[PDB]
């Protein structure tokens, strides 16, 4: 497994999260990213999975960018 390289334009932020105890689905890790950009007043423009543990992962990486 190799983590995806995400594109981070100017004033965007690269974020990531993981927990060696968890083993969650892709859809769960998406909602983690979409909400984290949301309560920062930013949109989700790019994301990928971290640490595979069947279609389940221990982490996520994503990019938030300002709105409008």
């Amino acid at each position: 497994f190799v983590s995806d390289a995400l594109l981070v334009p100017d004033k965007c932020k690269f974020l990531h999260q993981e927990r060696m105890d968890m083993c969650e689905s892709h859809l769960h890790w998406h909602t983690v990213a979409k909400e984290s950009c949301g309560d920062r007043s930013m949109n989700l423009h790019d994301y990928g999975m971290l640490l595979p543990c069947i279609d389940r992962f221990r982490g996520v990486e994503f990019v938030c960018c300002p709105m409008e």
């Binding site: 190799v2 983590s3 390289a5 995400l6 990531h16 993981e18 927990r19 640490l51 982490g59």
Partner: protein
């Protein structure tokens, strides 16, 4: 009238990222009032037992508790206390139970960030992994940033292994032997540390496009032969590939030269035998197409 005895029942009242509050029970004063206490500690990264700084700076004989300061976050410690009277310093106490300090964000960057090499369409980024005593927490990983030199934004990726020392990015947009700006950071469960300074690493180059030509050979002895060819993306040397008449090219031996030497000598051959020899250029991206084969006898 001799030095005092050792304290007993060393206990850790609390522990933080850098401090540890300790308590202990006094031993015999050996007819001389204990004037002060002193504290030592030991980690897997210390040269055995070492003295520590405390608050207060001087732990008096009436003090059965003190705070050790200036510890290393996320490090497993054990402590001991020594009594000291007017006659002299006493025997150390027994070690406390092991206690790991609390964690924090990493304060260091990966050392010796560098890279280069690989096959075409690849960008190789390397770094010296952070040793355990500087990681400052569980879940230690790395963040790698890179971009073509002069670009606006960055490409970034989380590399979660604490022992990760290499990240390889492959893409059809990677131009051969092109410069990239690269910086590598660190992180653990408590947050992210700082990035290192921006360095320039070049992408992988392309293997040689052409074969050497005019391959000729002549024997020097029953086991030694001299091989020469003609010169031609850059080249760092040439690779010989040889096998005897009753063998195949794929199950052969290899020999590599460095530079533009254009000549080479093969040892270890058998006398009165026929061999086949192939010369092939190479750089860091691999080899190019081979030259037409030559046959020589010993």
């Amino acid at each position: 009238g001799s030095p005092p005895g050792p304290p007993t029942s060393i206990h850790v009242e609390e522990i933080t990222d850098t401090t540890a509050t300790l308590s202990w029970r006094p031993g015999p004063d050996n007819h001389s009032p204990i004037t002060a206490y002193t504290i030592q500690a030991r980690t897997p990264f210390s040269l055995g037992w070492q003295a520590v700084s405390t608050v207060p700076e001087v732990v008096g004989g009436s003090h059965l508790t003190a705070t050790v300061i200036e510890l290393n976050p996320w490090v497993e410690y054990e402590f001991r206390v020594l009594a000291s009277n007017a006659v002299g310093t006493g025997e150390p106490s027994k070690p406390s139970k092991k206690a790991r300090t609390k964690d924090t964000v990493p304060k260091v960057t990966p050392a010796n960030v560098s890279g280069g090499g690989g096959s075409r369409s690849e960008l190789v980024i390397t770094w010296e992994p952070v040793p355990e005593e500087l990681q400052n927490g569980a879940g230690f990983g790395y963040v790698v940033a890179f971009r073509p030199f002069g670009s606006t934004g960055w490409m970034q990726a989380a590399v979660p292994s604490p022992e990760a020392s290499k990240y390889v990015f492959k893409n059809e947009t990677i131009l051969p032997f092109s410069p990239f700006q690269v910086k590598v950071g660190a992180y653990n469960n408590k947050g992210e540390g700082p990035f290192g300074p921006v360095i320039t690493i070049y992408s992988a180059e392309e293997e040689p496009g052409r074969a050497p030509s005019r391959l000729r050979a002549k024997s020097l002895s029953a086991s030694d032969v001299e091989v020469s060819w003609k010169a031609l993306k850059r080249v760092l040397g040439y690779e010989l590939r040889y096998w005897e008449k009753n063998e195949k090219e794929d199950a052969s031996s290899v020999l590599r030269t460095v530079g533009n030497r254009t000549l080479a000598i093969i040892q270890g051959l058998k006398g009165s035998s026929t061999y086949y020899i192939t010369v092939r250029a190479y750089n860091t991206a691999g080899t190019g197409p081979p030259s037409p084969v030559v046959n020589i006898t010993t």
